[model samples]
Target: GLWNRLEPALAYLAPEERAKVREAYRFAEEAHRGQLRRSGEPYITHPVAVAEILAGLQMDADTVAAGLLHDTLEDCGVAPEELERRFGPTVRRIVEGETKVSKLYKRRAEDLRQMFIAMAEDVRIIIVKLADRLHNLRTLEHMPPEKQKRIAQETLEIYAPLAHRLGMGQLKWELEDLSFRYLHPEAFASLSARIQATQEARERLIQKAIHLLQETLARDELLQSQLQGFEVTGRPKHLYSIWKKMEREGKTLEQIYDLLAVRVILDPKPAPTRESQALREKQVCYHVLGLVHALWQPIPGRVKDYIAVPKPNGYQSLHTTVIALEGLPLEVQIRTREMHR
Candidate 1:
């Protein structure tokens, strides 16, 4: 299974890098031999899954190799000194930084300083930790009740939001929804059913919208060019956002939100800058916004120009709601492909 996934990525890597990944896999496998997960799967399976996740992200060889042995320092008797000698200093430092996150505090200021020191030294430490947390969240069902809730709560306040801050929206949203599913089972279940029911009941609404918009976008320069490769789906509505929607709807949560809007997720590609690139990118977004407005009747006061005004977490997008031919509100989003990643 590991080789099947790693094979695709190895084409981009050298023979030496591939050999190191193989070696790291074998080492982790041996170190974790006697261990098993809560699901009774061999513990090595978790690291393999982590490496696969990183592989999908198209991570570098050192990163992939470290992913294979991410837990060795704590879980196995493997030492950082040994890892440094075997895999070089980069791998050892990253693994060591993550391992030390557990011991974050001695007092107050010194604790904070040490924490920043580790992150400042090597930011990949955080990425590795996030990948680790993602796998743990994926397999959370196997843990005991107390452990599950604890981990879920920790994830809500820590990992998911950190992913958002790091500009990894795909990982960010999944982490949010999964942790939400565990933390509030009843809400998650009821809301999930509602989402499904809403989809089946009004599936035609979105399908109709996409059919109309797809034809519309196919001709537009924004879509005809790099941004054309788009994903049309329901806008990402998490537990918190759903609650807010319910507040705004006043028992009409299922009625207005889904039926009113179909999200067109677009990723525009641009090259270079703080000033020139930002201007060119924002201009591109504005151009698309103008096209969407001219194509459809945009809802006044509903346009959000986040490209010019980025969010706290550095998210940039152009959001607008327009009246579709289907007689429902449609929401369209325009962002860079890199931003989507």
Candidate 2:
């Protein structure tokens, strides 16, 4: 599947670049040749797929090259220096970056801090690792139920939120939905079916609401702003988060109604520094909340201003439970484009 689908993406490269990539691919393929995945497919397919995902992001050559060679140091006999000789220092650095956090896997709490430090040092490593994990989660059904549950839980608690913090919405949602599927299959199925049944109606309502808001904002000369609505689909909570929640509530998934929500991201005027940008981000949350209340009735006791009091991990947003145009009990999140990007 990877060879069939990803080959086309490589067409954009020059023959020399393609050959260089192919050499790394061949090295990985040969190293992992005898290995078989849980689904019994050749294990080489995974690293190849991960590389393709990196390629799609238009990442640097070293990132894509490192992606192809990531698991080689972990699962294969290849050493980092060997990869460096074959590739380059940049590629080798990324491979080391991918492995740096992984080396601390047994120390979970410390690993969390170490992982963030690795990410802050070289963000592309996390991006490549996420692509690898995303592909693995997609194929999680091949794994045992217990293993699947653990992977899903880890993804939800760590990777999904990290992706959100990095402003990678697409990665965040996919990670969430994949974890959701494994963690709460029944709830995920029910919510998905309900949303699908009314998909068209929901879209129409959201478009109408967005149109009205845009018109109103335009009237106020707020032409720089845009508005849109509808619930975002995410992976259901991972089993661990759900289990913890259940322990807190003394109940099960049936008792949870606040798992679903919508997000509103607004692009604001650029600020000078990262600190100023963060301050502007907090202001954007307030501004977006004002606009939302002007358009819809927010449920009492539902507004949460996380900007003034950020979570320990630095998540900041304005959250409110509100009735949408269709009177559905929906939760809305207001955050800046800086937060999103």
Candidate 3:
């Protein structure tokens, strides 16, 4: 089933490498032959999907192969020595790296710290595990509600933060959203309704704003500096994050100005001289602000000059909330590509 979707990507690999991956796939398939997921589909599909995720990331051979075999030692009764014999030392080491920490302590903090150290040692292990967990979560609807809640809580507590800390924004968001669904169904439903209510209008305004910026930059002969604009898209809030925010500020989602926001990234040109980097960044920020203000009415007290005073986390941006065509509040985050990246 994944063949058509994965073939174009696979074509980029050498014939020998493809054959080796195929061999690993066959090995995993045979190992999981009779197994079935809670969804009752062949359990092998999970590994295949995980391997596909790694392949899409253009990960190395060891990572892809390890993705195929990630759950073998954990759940399939396969021995580590058997994996070492079948695969080379690199693959074996990767498999060992993917193994769970021994449950030697009663408190989770100790185990979590050890897990973090393991991930720091070999980033590929976490990436592979993320793919595995992602697939399992996707199929979570097939499980009972109690099991679903447990898995979702674990994902939110552990996996989501780990993904964010690693700077894997794509994985982090998905993990949070999925965990939110099961952990707080009521909040998730409410947020979904709010998002759907504003979806179409928000899209149109974003498109128009992006188009105007593109044209303005082109006119200035700074077309190369106009980085691709991205729509700021996110659910209203995850329950856990929302709860913490409300606890701190004593306000709900209704008080959050940036429930949904858009980010405008401007490509930074290399400074002619090393000392000119800060100046060049400021110039880019000014240019971005001009473009934004020319298209929308900036709201009072909403402008932020992070370029001049960067955030503690080193985030630099010029933020503004503005009224668009219909007086709808729209947030525009302006930042250089260097900052955004």
The alpha-carbon deviation from the true structure for residue 154 of candidate 3, after best TM-score superposition, in angstroms, is 2.4
Clashes of each: 0, 3, 0
* Candidate 3 structure, TM-score to reference: 0.77
Indicate which candidate wins on lDDT.
1
Q: What is the per-residue lDDT of model 3 for residues 9-116, given as tens digits with 9 covering 90 to 100?
A: 666578877776777878888888798876768877877888887787787877888888876776557888888887777777777766674210015576567667
Give candidate 3's error at residue 155 in angstroms: 1.9
lDDT of 3 at 257: 57
Instruction: Please provide, for model 1 over 1-341, each residue's C-alpha lDDT reduced to its tens digit, 9 standing for 90 to 100.
Output: 45565566666678898888888888888888888877888888888888877777777788888888878877568888988998899888877887776531013345335546777877687777778788888988787777778767776777777788887876876777788778888888877776654434455666776676667666776445544366655543455556546767676653453334555555555545566655554555666677778878887788887877989999878788788765556677766555563
What lDDT score belongs to each candidate, Candidate 1 first? Answer: 0.71, 0.69, 0.70
User: What lDDT tens digits, residue by residue, belong to model 2 across residues 1-341?
Assistant: 35666667777677777777888887888778788876778878888888888787666767777888787776568888888888888888878888767731123576667777886668877888788889888888777787778778888889998888887766776788789889878866765664443434544655665565555444543424322222222222333344547668787455543444456666656666888866665655676677778777888898988778878888777788767655655566777654552
Could you tell me the C-alpha RMSD of candidate 2 in Å? 7.3
What's the TM-score of every candidate structure? 0.69, 0.59, 0.77
Poorest lDDT segment (10 consecutive residues) of candidate 2: 226-235
lDDT for predicted candidate 3 compared with the true structure:
0.70
Q: Where is the poorest 10-residue window by lDDT in model 1?
A: 103-112
